[PDB]
Amino acid sequence: RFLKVKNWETDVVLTDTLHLKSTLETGCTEHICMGSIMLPVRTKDQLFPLAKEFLDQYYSSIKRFGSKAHMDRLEEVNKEIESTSTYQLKDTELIYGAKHAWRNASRCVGRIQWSKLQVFDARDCTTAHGMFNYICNHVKYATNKGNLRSAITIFPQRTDGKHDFRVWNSQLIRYAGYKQPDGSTLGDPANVQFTEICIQQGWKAPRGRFDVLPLLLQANGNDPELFQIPPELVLEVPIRHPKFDWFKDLGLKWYGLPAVSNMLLEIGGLEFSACPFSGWYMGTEIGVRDYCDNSRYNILEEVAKKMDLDMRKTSSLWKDQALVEINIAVLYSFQSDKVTIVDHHSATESFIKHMENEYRCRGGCPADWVWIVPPMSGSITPVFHQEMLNYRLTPSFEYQPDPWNTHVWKG
Amino acid sequence: RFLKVKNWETDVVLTDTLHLKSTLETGCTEHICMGSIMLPDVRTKDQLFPLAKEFLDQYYSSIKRFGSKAHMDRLEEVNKEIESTSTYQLKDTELIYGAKHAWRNASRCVGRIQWSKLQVFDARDCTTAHGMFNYICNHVKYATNKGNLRSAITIFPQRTDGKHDFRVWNSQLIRYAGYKQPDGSTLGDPANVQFTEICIQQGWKAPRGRFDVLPLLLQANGNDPELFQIPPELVLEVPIRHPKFDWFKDLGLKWYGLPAVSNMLLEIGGLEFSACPFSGWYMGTEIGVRDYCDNSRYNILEEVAKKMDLDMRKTSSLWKDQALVEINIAVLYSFQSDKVTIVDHHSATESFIKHMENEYRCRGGCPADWVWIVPPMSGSITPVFHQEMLNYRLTPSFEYQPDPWNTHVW
Numbered sequence: 129r130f131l132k133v134k135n136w137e138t139d140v141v142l143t144d145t146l147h148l149k150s151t152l153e154t155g156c157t158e159h160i161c162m163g164s165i166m167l168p169v170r171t172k173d174q175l176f177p178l179a180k181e182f183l184d185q186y187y188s189s190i191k192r193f194g195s196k197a198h199m200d201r202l203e204e205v206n207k208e209i210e211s212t213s214t215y216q217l218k219d220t221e222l223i224y225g226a227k228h229a230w231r232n233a234s235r236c237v238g239r240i241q242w243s244k245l246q247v248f249d250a251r252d253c254t255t256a257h258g259m260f261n262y263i264c265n266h267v268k269y270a271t272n273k274g275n276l277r278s279a280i281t282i283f284p285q286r287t288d289g290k291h292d293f294r295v296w297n298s299q300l301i302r303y304a305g306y307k308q309p310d311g312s313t314l315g316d317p318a319n320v321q322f323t324e325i326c327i328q329q330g331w332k333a334p335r336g337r338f339d340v341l342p343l344l345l346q347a348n349g350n351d352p353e354l355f356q357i358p359p360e361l362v363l364e365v366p367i368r369h370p371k372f373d374w375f376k377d378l379g380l381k382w383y384g385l386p387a388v389s390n391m392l393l394e395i396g397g398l399e400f401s402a403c404p405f406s407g408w409y410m411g412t413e414i415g416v417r418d419y420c421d422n423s424r425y426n427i428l429e430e431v432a433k434k435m436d437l438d439m440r441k442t443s444s445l446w447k448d449q450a451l452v453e454i455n456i457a458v459l460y461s462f463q464s465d466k467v468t469i470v471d472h473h474s475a476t477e478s479f480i481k482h483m484e485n486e487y488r489c490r491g492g493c494p495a496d497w498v499w500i501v502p503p504m505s506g507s508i509t510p511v512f513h514q515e516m517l518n519y520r521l522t523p524s525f526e527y528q529p530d531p532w533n534t535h536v537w538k539g
Numbered sequence: 540r541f542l543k544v545k546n547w548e549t550d551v552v553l554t555d556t557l558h559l560k561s562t563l564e565t566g567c568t569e570h571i572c573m574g575s576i577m578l579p580d581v582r583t584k585d586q587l588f589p590l591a592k593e594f595l596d597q598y599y600s601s602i603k604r605f606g607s608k609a610h611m612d613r614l615e616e617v618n619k620e621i622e623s624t625s626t627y628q629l630k631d632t633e634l635i636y637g638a639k640h641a642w643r644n645a646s647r648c649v650g651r652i653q654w655s656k657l658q659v660f661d662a663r664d665c666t667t668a669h670g671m672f673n674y675i676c677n678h679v680k681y682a683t684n685k686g687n688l689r690s691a692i693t694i695f696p697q698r699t700d701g702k703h704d705f706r707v708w709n710s711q712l713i714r715y716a717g718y719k720q721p722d723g724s725t726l727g728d729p730a731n732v733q734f735t736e737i738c739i740q741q742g743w744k745a746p747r748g749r750f751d752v753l754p755l756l757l758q759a760n761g762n763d764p765e766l767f768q769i770p771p772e773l774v775l776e777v778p779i780r781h782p783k784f785d786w787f788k789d790l791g792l793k794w795y796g797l798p799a800v801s802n803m804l805l806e807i808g809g810l811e812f813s814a815c816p817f818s819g820w821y822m823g824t825e826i827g828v829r830d831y832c833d834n835s836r837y838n839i840l841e842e843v844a845k846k847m848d849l850d851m852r853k854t855s856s857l858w859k860d861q862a863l864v865e866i867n868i869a870v871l872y873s874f875q876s877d878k879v880t881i882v883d884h885h886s887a888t889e890s891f892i893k894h895m896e897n898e899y900r901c902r903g904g905c906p907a908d909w910v911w912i913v914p915p916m917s918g919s920i921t922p923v924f925h926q927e928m929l930n931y932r933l934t935p936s937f938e939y940q941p942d943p944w945n946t947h948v949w
């Protein structure tokens with residue numbers, strides 16, 4: 129069975145066969161679409177078919193399918209599973225898996241870069257201190273003095289689920305958020321809950337509007353531990369505007385390295401619960417969401433005042449106006465400091481090229497329109513008019529519960 | 540099975556049971572979501588009865604007379620008529636209820652908070668294109684109401700054997716012409732280039748301007764369609780000027796006040812109304828973001844940003860975004876200045892969130908297609924962006940249908 133998608137701006141039609149290789153479920157049915165829902169201890173019983181399926185993919189990709197090396201590896205994995213109840217990926221397989229988990233990330237507009245991912249194997253790590261070291265080196269290598277490089281660090285896989293490695297931070301670098309007694313919030317409202325945990329765990333908060341949070345790291349199921357990233361490793365960018373001299377006086381800055389650390393990487397049935405990965409920012413992530421979301425820094429008001437906009441009627445589109453200027457200032461600041469950033473126009477254009485290339489050489493590209501389309505100026509970006517098919521392929525990155533909700537506290 | 544939707548900006552959670560009354564199919568499966576796909580012989584006596592029963596059952600419940608004499612009587616009445624005549628006709632009451640609920644159920648429409656204040660014009664006694672033209676002029680004048688726009692639908696006779704279809708061939712009642720140039724590009728409105736050609740190919744004398752209102756191409760009882768010119772005094776237009784930039788008038792821009800979609804099919808109780816133009820009023824972005832700035836449309840973005848002397852050498856200057864905002868400010872300004880109804884995307888999305896709440900509260904849910912409900916600009920600073928939505932197909936409903944010129948036997 130073949131399925132088609134149409135770009136309605138260019139009339140270009142692409143044929144997806146890859147969707148057939150999909151096993152996992154979307155959340156949708158014949159009678160309901162869950163396309164806009166945010167989110168719609170594994171035994172030896174169900175593990176080898178997962179293992180086999182992955183190794184089949186792996187050896188296909190290296191043109192060794194059916195080879196003696198392929199079959200021997202199947203047998204080796206088999207025996208190791210029935211013997212140890214799990215199994216270990218070779219380095220080659222780990223690297224392939226991590227790249228393809230990104231390649232398959234249907235909500236990610238940056239996937240044109242998927243094959244140049246730098247994979248750091250931290251599966252030998254045993255302690256939080258050890259984790260801190262791996263993460264410091266990740267941050268230093270990824271940052272590259274502003275010339276950002278994609279990277280992922282992979283900590284040991286889940287065993288019995290009682291010995292997980294977790295990074296408790298949702299990102300390696302994020303700013304603290306403080307709920308004040310008068311109801312207002314200091315810093316980043318998105319991080320108030322995590323910030324409180326840190327403080328309870330003994331973190332001494334500067335209580336400023338842009339405090340970098342400590343790393344809260346969990347090794348082998350033990351209680352998590354606090355570490356401070358060396359400030360010289362955290363590259364930041366003062367936010368100013370090319371035309372508005374008063375914008376600097378808003379006192380804003382953002383960090384340069386987006387590094388998501390609370391997701392789970394799944395490869396051939398193995399579960400990697402701590403796998404922080406990083407690339408670089410699309411401007412709108414900071415300038416639209418991180419600044420202008422009502423539940424975030426929410427500086428729309430302030431910028432609109434300084435621009436002397438008509439904030440009386442919404443139909444003055446003062447919000448729209450301020451949003452653009454803020455995103456202008458974010459791109460300007462990063463480029464000025466030679467820190468890698470991509471605008472939403474460049475990025476969506478790239479993606480369409482990536483998508484078309486993926487449909488031809490792979491037979492498809494799973495894509496989530498709800499997430500791919502930028503949070504401003506959607507229809508003047510080429511993904512808006514692009515029909516997309518969304519399905520779930522493995523290896524994949526998955527959501528997982530916040531560790532503080534499931535963790536058994538040692539003490 | 541009883542599904543929840545959460546708003547991630549406000550943590551409001553709604554429980555959806557209405558979806559369990561869904562009959563039609565979405566195009567998705569458990570393995571694949573087709574949520575971003577644009578579009579993912581007559582009814583027998585067999586399939587027609589249950590569609591009628593289902594519709595009549597919900598009609599008589601809506602009037603709190605489920606299981607009444609009237610209900611069973613009307614049910615048996617239609618039951619009898621279908622077996623005889625092989626189809627059936629709706630009571631006026633049922634027709635109005637049906638049309639209102641096709642709108643209410645339009646999962647892609649952000650303006651549904653107005654759904655029950657629809658004005659239904661029964662045009663089932665129409666027999667000719669001339670008659671269609673008359674009804675359509677009356678619709679237009681009533682809907683326009685001197686700029687105080689009013690929602691309306693006009694319903695022409697229902698399909699019979701598919702050989703006698705009433706169709707309005709225009710995609711909308713009022714739209715501008717699109718002319719292909721020997722120069723290469725496109726003058727007027729590019730979206731409408733093929734239809735403009737058909738009108739000429741059917742005899743229309745094109746003034747070949749930039750804002751030439753298209754004629755109506757009306758088809759009654761399955762005969763060849765006929766050209767008609769809408770009296771210009773019934774076509775309310777708004778000249779587009781900017782409250783800040785004087786040079787904006789010189790772009791020579793205007794748009795019409797009345798959005799009236801005319802190529803969709805209305806389905807009620809299994810019955811098929813292939814001609815049912817309906818209209819309300821514009822959300823600003825419908826004109827300014829899409830009808831002006833889409834690459835496949837007026838695409839005036841370049842000329843606008845030029846006139847603002849923005850740095851157009853790199854995309855990261857966001858000159859497109861900056862222009863796009865100004866244009867939509869002007870569209871809103873112009874319509875408001877000339878006292879023509881219009882709503883901004885902040886206003887409409889906020890209303891839709893309110894509408895959603897109402898529907899979960901009094902009806903147990905509201906089918907909603909996030910991909911189409913979020914406006915084409917400034918998505919995340921509008922409240923629907925952070926709103927989870929469930930999409931499912933309820934009936935009565937509006938449906939897409941083939942373009943008539945791919946179908947019509949001359």
Ligand code: HEM
Nearest residue numbers: 230233235236237238241278279405406407408409410525
């Ligand atoms: C290098 C440049 C990259 C860019 C510009 C980029 C951009 C984006 C953006 C804009 C989103 C939307 C998420 C949001 O709005 O919150 C996203 C999602 C995502 N990205 Fe990428 N990304 C990049 C690199 C990477 C890398 C290196 C990985 C992992 C190896 C990755 C994995 C993902 C995943 C798994 C999601 C979906 C998360 C979810 O479902 O919530 N990205 N990306």
Ligand code: HEM
Nearest residue numbers: 642645647648649650653690691817818819820821822937
């Ligand atoms: C009164 C104010 C109204 C507003 C502000 C409004 C707004 C919109 C918008 C913005 C869309 C998205 C489509 C696009 O961007 O091209 C849409 C779709 C739609 N509207 Fe509404 N609308 C209104 C009235 C009505 C009425 C009176 C009806 C019918 C009785 C209706 C039926 C529909 C339908 C069926 C669609 C989906 C068409 C499709 O599936 O392609 N609308 N509307």
Ligand SMILES: CN[C@@H](C)Cc1cc(C#N)cc(OCc2ccc3c(C)cc(N)nc3c2)c1
Nearest residue numbers: 386387388390391405406407408409410417527
């Ligand atoms: C603002 N929406 C968020 C609240 C939703 C979200 C949740 C999670 C998780 N868990 C992870 C998420 O990450 C998206 C993502 C992941 C990785 C990225 C990388 C590596 C680079 C980049 N520029 N953006 C990313 C964006 C997002």
Ligand SMILES: CN[C@@H](C)Cc1cc(C#N)cc(OCc2ccc3c(C)cc(N)nc3c2)c1
Nearest residue numbers: 798799800802803817818819820821822829939
């Ligand atoms: C810009 N995307 C369009 C090209 C896709 C579209 C297709 C069809 C059809 N057939 C019908 C469509 O109509 C949407 C619609 C329908 C009715 C509306 C009413 C009554 C008012 C209004 N302001 N907008 C509407 C918008 C749209």
Ligand SMILES: C[C@H](O)[C@H](O)[C@H]1CNc2nc(N)[nH]c(=O)c2N1
Nearest residue numbers: 164165166498499924925926927
């Ligand atoms: C409710 C909705 O599904 C949710 O807010 C999604 C929509 N699309 C998104 N798209 C991106 N890129 N990032 C997001 O966080 C979201 N949030």
Ligand SMILES: C[C@H](O)[C@H](O)[C@H]1CNc2nc(N)[nH]c(=O)c2N1
Nearest residue numbers: 512513514515575576577910911
């Ligand atoms: C590709 C995509 O399905 C298509 O362009 C849709 C997306 N969302 C839309 N949303 C609205 N309101 N109107 C549209 O025409 C579209 N087009």
Ligand SMILES: [Zn+2]
Nearest residue numbers: 156161567572
């Ligand atoms: Zn779906």
